[PDB]
């Protein structure tokens, strides 16, 4: 009808990538307080009914591989998919302890053509990272 | 018949393009704090966009960065949602 069909064996996978530590060479610093978020997010999405997995301090290669493998799994009996990203960022890019990778490359793995079992199903991505250096001063 | 390959995707960014995202080393990021907060309270009874709109408003209001620097002092933040969804999403029933 007008709503995504939720009648499935399970709600789905909820992948959480918690990057707190990075390589000195990246110039990024320890993202203190990210564990708080990760702990919060997981307990929270677990309640919704997701089968949540938490990954820590991943390399760029790891993030890519991790997500690709996920897109290659069988999502036939899942209502949807959800991925959460907690790390350093810049416009269109997301950090790994390794370095930098395009957010689009990570999510492309789930395109309709590239992830048949998740077709017609909601693919969700939450991202906690910067998208540049501008600051919103505000108003009133 | 066919369907777009970009269809059914939704992105919930803690901030808009070109800006910073705020995180408290002790409390955790604002966006995540807010998200979880709203999901605890309405996770199963509100449509996804409803939840996220509420998160947007929460981050918009409640928070304001405190720093002893003219550049980082008393700054605001607004999340950014990108939807390619073709149906309403609810996490139950």
């Amino acid at each position: 009808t007008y709503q995504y069909n939720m009648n499935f064996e399970k709600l789905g996978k909820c992948i959480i990538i918690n990057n707190k530590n990075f390589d000195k060479v990246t110039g990024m610093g320890v993202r203190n307080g990210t564990d708080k978020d990760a702990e919060a997010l997981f307990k929270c999405f677990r309640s919704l009914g997701f089968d949540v997995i938490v990954y820590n301090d991943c390399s760029c290669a790891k993030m890519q591989d991790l997500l690709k493998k996920a897109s290659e799994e069988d999502h036939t009996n899942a209502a949807c998919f959800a991925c959460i990203l907690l790390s350093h960022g810049e416009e269109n890019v997301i950090y790994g302890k390794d370095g930098v990778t395009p957010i689009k490359d990570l999510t492309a793995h789930f395109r309709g053509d590239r992830c048949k079992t998740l077709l017609e199903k909601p693919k969700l991505f939450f991202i906690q990272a910067c998208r540049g250096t501008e600051l919103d001063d505000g108003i009133q | 018949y066919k369907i777009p390959v970009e269809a059914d995707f939704l992105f919930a960014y803690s901030t808009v393009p070109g800006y910073y995202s705020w995180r408290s080393p002790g409390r955790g990021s604002w966006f995540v704090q807010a998200l979880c907060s709203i999901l605890e309270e309405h996770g199963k009874d509100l449509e996804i966009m409803q939840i996220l709109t509420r998160v947007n408003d929460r981050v918009a209001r409640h928070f304001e960065s405190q720093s002893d620097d003219p550049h980082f002092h008393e700054k605001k933040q607004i999340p950014c949602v990108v939807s390619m969804l073709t149906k309403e999403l609810y996490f139950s029933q």
């Binding site: 203190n32 | 995202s21 995180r23 080393p25 980082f72």
Partner: peptide, 4 residues
Amino acid sequence: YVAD
């Protein structure tokens, strides 16, 4: 607070 700190930027991410």
